[PDB]
Design an enzyme around this catalytic site. Structure first.
Site, mmCIF file in Angstrom:
data_model
loop_
_atom_site.group_PDB
_atom_site.id
_atom_site.type_symbol
_atom_site.label_atom_id
_atom_site.label_comp_id
_atom_site.label_asym_id
_atom_site.label_seq_id
_atom_site.Cartn_x
_atom_site.Cartn_y
_atom_site.Cartn_z
ATOM 1 N N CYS A 140 11.636 56.276 28.050
ATOM 2 C CA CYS A 140 11.840 57.504 28.061
ATOM 3 C C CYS A 140 10.602 58.180 27.347
ATOM 4 O O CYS A 140 10.573 58.266 26.138
ATOM 5 C CB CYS A 140 13.059 57.988 27.531
ATOM 6 S SG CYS A 140 13.290 59.626 27.110
ATOM 7 N N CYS A 198 11.469 61.192 24.802
ATOM 8 C CA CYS A 198 11.973 60.724 23.586
ATOM 9 C C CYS A 198 11.077 60.206 22.724
ATOM 10 O O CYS A 198 10.931 60.217 21.307
ATOM 11 C CB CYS A 198 13.000 59.483 23.925
ATOM 12 S SG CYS A 198 14.409 59.687 25.134
#
Length: 107
Positions: free
Chosen positions: A32, A35
């Site tokens: 991700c 993230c």
């Protein structure tokens, strides 16, 4: 320090639900990008609140139970938790100042 913890499905109850103060739960994974983009900001928030906020990182590849319990439908998902109860959730990356304001708003 940055007051950032690696929390598992087995330690979530102790580390998050039975935490003192305010917890910022960060559901993340290595795939991700967003993230990883917000990670420095989260650590900075942990430093800036000087222990009043704990950043609880939950890797969703290793810990499927917790994101399922909280109906995590995509990551990043952040949650503010206090006294074992969710106060609010955010989905998607945000700039540091907006993250900080969100934490502050919990009081």
């Amino acid at each position: 320090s940055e007051h950032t913890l690696a929390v598992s499905d087995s330690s979530f109850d102790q580390d998050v639900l039975k935490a003192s103060g305010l917890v910022l739960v960060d559901f993340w994974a290595e795939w991700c990008g967003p993230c990883k983009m917000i990670g420095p900001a989260l650590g900075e928030i942990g430093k800036e609140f000087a222990g009043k906020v704990t950043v609880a990182k939950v890797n969703i590849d290793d810990n499927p139970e917790t994101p399922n319990a909280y109906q995590v439908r995509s990551i990043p998902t952040l949650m503010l938790v206090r006294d074992g109860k969710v106060i609010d959730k955010k989905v998607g990356a945000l700039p540091k100042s907006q993250l900080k304001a969100w934490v502050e708003s919990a009081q």
